[PDB]
Amino acid sequence: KVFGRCELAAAMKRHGLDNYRGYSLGNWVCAAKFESNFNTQATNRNTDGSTDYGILQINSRWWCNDGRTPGSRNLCNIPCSALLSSDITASVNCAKKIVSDGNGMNAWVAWRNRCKGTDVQAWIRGCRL
């Protein structure tokens, strides 16, 4: 599913992401825009043989099992295909583990390079939340 900006903001708010570990909702929308272009089906293969899955491009080396990433962990305890669902619940629950891990949202390279230190409130402007 390809989400609208406000539709996704509302879904993330209902799943408890607004101010989760201090990150306002605009941060999560900005990250999703630049990671996946708001497309739950996005996949991208990395040089190391790991793959990034879904709206928040969660990586198979640490967070999910795709059956093809040797010596990988599955810290979210989910098949990576669960992250491509139109229901963002599995992605959100896994993102909460990731952002609690010590690096905060710096774990998302697109957030660090394209969202961090920008006016992220702009991503939820105009939305009925």
Q: Which residues are annotated as a binding site for substrate?
A: 101
The single-letter DSSP state of residue 98 is: H
Is residue 7 annotated as part of the catalytic site, yes or no?
no
Is residue 52 annotated as part of the catalytic site, yes or no?
yes
Per partner kind, with CB cut-offs from 5 to 8 A, the member of Cl ion, Na ion, none near residue 10 is none
Chain length of the chain: 129
Residue 109, sorted as left (phi over 0), alpha (psi -120 to 50) or beta, turns out to be alpha
Which position among 72, 111, 115, 120 is part of the footprint of Na ion (CB under 5 A)?
A: 72
| Touching Cl ion, residues 45-74 (CB under 5 A) | 65, 69, 72-74
Interface contacts to Na ion, rule CB under 5 A: 60, 65, 69, 72, 74
